[PDB]
């Protein structure tokens, strides 16, 4: 994973990307298609393009490059936000508090019980299943950080 | 990992939690500590709490309950935001376009090339390493969705 400064570096350079997203998107796809021409075959609209000049002249290529970099930017930003909260929690619970995954299972059990007890009208079988799944995602994401850190959990 | 309706159900019950985060948190920790007393042994600052009534009386147990559920809610919500960004892309790239991970590697390297080419002062060695790592996280996250969707990338 990335450190906090590395995430900020990603954000900073993406701001440059978004300041000229059309130019960046064009250049990315041109680099892809010239370096790896087989990738062109995936694109009905593009697969006839043979030269960088032809690629730069394609309005369809330019708008697709923007679509790609817009989508990737959002994924990167949202990953960064999740990481910024997950990472410190995994770090402290692995290295200072030394909390095994089974104990995260136990608190998940308690959360499910408390929610069912307090809010049965908002916690029927499907909603309880949803929360059970969500808490498992959380535990798994912590466990993956534990493994990176070397903590048995 | 959850459907859209399941995420809605999670966020709906979480809104109920947020109407009294401290009460919910207190109740979760007391459930945990009463059911699994070894978990209370991890909290050196709660060594004075032995009985259920003592737990109920503790200002700091309740405050810690707030800390725990505030953190968990942020992580759950941010996971949901990231999932929702990954979802449309993994759907199409697995099931319609059928883009191998090797082609995602190619476009990742193309992005790094373009950023180096365009911004060498800003996008030096460390920032390039950051972006390289971030794009690997992206590819691995899509690869995990591919396997859930039955697509060998
Ligand atoms: C950073 C990686 C990538 C991102 C963020 C990305 C994003 C997108 C987006 C947002 C769309 C339009 C909506 C959709 O169909 O999902 C799209 C379409 C498509 N992508 Fe990707 N893509 C990536 C990599 C690739 C690669 C490497 C290839 C092929 C070698 C590819 C092939 C396609 C194809 C064929 C379409 C449909 C084009 C059309 O019919 O207009 N994608 N991509
Ligand atoms: C939903 C799961 C959990 C969440 C979101 C959570 C959250 C937190 C947060 C936000 C802190 C303060 C900042 C930090 O040190 O990271 C904390 C501290 C701590 N957590 Fe957790 N925690 C969870 C589960 C557990 C479990 C199950 C245990 C023990 C069995 C545990 C033991 C501790 C301890 C010992 C501290 C330090 C308390 C003190 O300040 O003295 N945590 N936790
Ligand atoms: O794409
Ligand atoms: O905690």
UniProtKB/Swiss-Prot annotation, chains A, B:
GO terms for cellular component: sarcoplasm. Disulfide bonds: none annotated. It is an enzyme of class 1 (oxidoreductase). It catalyses: Fe(III)-heme b-[protein] + nitric oxide + H2O = Fe(II)-heme b-[protein] + nitrite + 2 H(+); H2O2 + AH2 = A + 2 H2O. O2 binds at residue 64. It is found in: Cytoplasm, Sarcoplasm. PROSITE patterns: GLOBIN. Its EC number is 1.7.-.-, 1.11.1.-. Keywords: Cytoplasm, Heme, Iron, Metal-binding, Muscle protein, Oxidoreductase, Oxygen transport, Phosphoprotein, Transport. GO terms for molecular function: heme binding; metal ion binding; nitrite reductase activity; oxygen binding; oxygen carrier activity; peroxidase activity. The modification Phosphoserine is found at residue 3. InterPro entries: Globin (IPR000971), Globin-like_sf (IPR009050), Myoglobin (IPR002335). CDD domains: Mb (cd08926). The keyword Transport applies. Residues 1-147 form the Globin domain. Heme b binds at residue 93. GO terms for biological process: oxygen transport; removal of superoxide radicals. Nitrite binds at residue 64. PANTHER family: MYOGLOBIN. Belongs to the globin family. Monomeric heme protein which primary function is to store oxygen and facilitate its diffusion within muscle tissues. Reversibly binds oxygen through a pentacoordinated heme iron and enables its timely and efficient release as needed during periods of heightened demand. Depending on the oxidative conditions of tissues and cells, and in addition to its ability to bind oxygen, it also has a nitrite reductase activity whereby it regulates the production of bioactive nitric oxide. Monomeric. This is Myoglobin. It comes from Equus caballus. The lineage of its organism: Eukaryota, Metazoa, Chordata, Craniata, Vertebrata. The gene is MB.
